[PDB]
Amino acid sequence: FTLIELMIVIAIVGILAAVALPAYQDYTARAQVSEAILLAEGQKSAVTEYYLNHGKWPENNTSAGVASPPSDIKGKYVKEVEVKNGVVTATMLSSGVNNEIKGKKLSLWARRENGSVKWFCGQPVTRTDDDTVADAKDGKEIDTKHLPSTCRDNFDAK
Amino acid sequence: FTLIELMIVIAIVGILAAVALPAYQDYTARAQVSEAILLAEGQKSAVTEYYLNHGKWPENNTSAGVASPPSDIKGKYVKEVEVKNGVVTATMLSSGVNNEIKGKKLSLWARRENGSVKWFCGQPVTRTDDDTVADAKDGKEIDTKHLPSTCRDNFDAK
Ligand SMILES: *[C@@H]1O[C@H](CO)[C@@H](O)[C@H](O[C@H]2O[C@H](CO)[C@H](O)[C@H](O)[C@H]2O)[C@H]1NC(C)=O
Ligand SMILES: *[C@@H]1O[C@H](CO)[C@@H](O)[C@H](O[C@H]2O[C@H](CO)[C@H](O)[C@H](O)[C@H]2O)[C@H]1NC(C)=O
Ligand SMILES: [Pt+2]
Ligand SMILES: [Pt+2]
């Protein structure tokens, strides 16, 4: 009459799952900031356009000509995507999202490579003047381990 | 779409089972030498009788008047129970039995407390003369951790 054998199969499948569990914990989180990155890249046409037609970065959602509140640029895991002086910043929600990335953010910004702009992707940045952004890391930025290698740009990237 | 939650329940039930598994491993083994002890205590009436009617310990199964081969005193986990000079020794099988106790043994022997005998239970012993046994530990004796506290007698017990 065999509990033991069953207790061995439960035991080996349950440590395998505990072993897997971190990897899938980190897989999901990368798929959840993947959307934030996509919601923010949607906004680059408008920003690029706005800067090209005028010489000035759009001050907000409404200048660039995208939905006036950021909360309307929201997804399954992103709460809001926001243009603030040509820098678009996506904030993760705090529901349906992994704890180490809930409520955190990344940013896309561009530099003029005179004739067009050059875009970058990375952790939050604030525009200081028409060609320089500065790190805006306040402790709510997506950790580097969850950012793709494409979106690892530092404030001074060129 | 939730693998994670399931992976957490599998993970917690599987470490609990790995935690339990030693205890139940040791539970079973105590229930398996429990039978060896019972198969050997069955044989004490005959041995006690034989010594009382004569002054000599029975030399074998056939003198004491129990089944001439020990292999016929066998159970679910015991292979054979054997009278050899008044000492009855039970050997565990090597199938249906836990590895740390498979093939190992214990022994019951008595001393004359003149008028009757006094019995003891413990790890194997060999009779040296009509009143002394000696430890017969050859490396095939049941470990102390699996012997009940009732069956912890040392060779020189009185
Ligand atoms: C759109 O982005 C421009 C970047 O250079 C801003 O000037 C612009 O603000 C100006 O236009 C609005 C129009 O209502 C207001 O008059 C502001 O006071 C102006 O500075 C900005 N538009 C918005 C709605 O902020
Ligand atoms: C039964 O136990 C006795 C203990 O004192 C032994 O002597 C006895 O052996 C003797 O009797 C048998 C009978 O067949 C043989 O004759 C032996 O040679 C005797 O020593 C023992 N009986 C057995 C079967 O060993
Ligand atoms: Pt304009
Ligand atoms: Pt006799």
From Swiss-Prot, chains A, B:
Compartments in which it is found = Fimbrium; Membrane
Query: What are the annotated disulfide bridges?
Result: C121-C151
The entry's stated outcome for S68A is: Alters the morphology of fibers
According to its UniProt entry, one GO biological process term is:
cell adhesion
Q: Region entry Disordered: which residue ranges?
A: 130-158
Q: Which PANTHER family match?
A: GENERAL SECRETION PATHWAY PROTEIN G, PREPILIN PEPTIDASE-DEPENDENT PROTEIN D
The reply on keyword Glycoprotein is: yes
Q: Which residues cross the membrane?
A: 1-21
**UniProt xrefs under InterPro entries:** N_methyl_site, Pilin, Pilin-like, T4P/T2SS_Core
Q: Where are residues bearing O-(2-aminoethylphosphoryl)serine located in the sequence? A: S68
Q: Which residues carry this modification: O-(2-cholinephosphoryl)serine?
A: S68
Disruption outcome: Deletion mutants show a complete absence of observable pili.
Residues that the record marks as modified (Phosphoserine) are S68
Give the sites modified to N-methylphenylalanine.
Answer: F1
> Residue positions of the PTM O-(sn-1-glycerophosphoryl)serine?
S94
Q: Which UniProt keywords apply?
A: Cell adhesion, Disulfide bond, Fimbrium, Glycoprotein, Membrane, Methylation, Phosphoprotein, Transmembrane, Transmembrane helix
Q: Which family is annotated?
A: Belongs to the N-Me-Phe pilin family.
Positions annotated with a glycan in the UniProt record: S63
This chain's source organism reads Neisseria gonorrhoeae
Q: What is its main location?
A: other
Upper lineage: Bacteria, Pseudomonadati, Pseudomonadota, Betaproteobacteria, Neisseriales
Q: Name one GO cellular component term.
A: membrane
Job of this protein: Major component of the type IV pilus (T4P) that plays a role in cellular adherence, microcolony formation, resistance to neutrophil mediated killing, twitching motility as well as transformation. Mediates the attachment and the formation of bacterial microcolonies on host epithelial cells. Mechanistically, pili retractation induces host NF-kappa-B activation in infected cells, which is temporally associated with the formation of gonococcal microcolonies.
What protein am I looking at?
Type IV major pilin protein PilE1
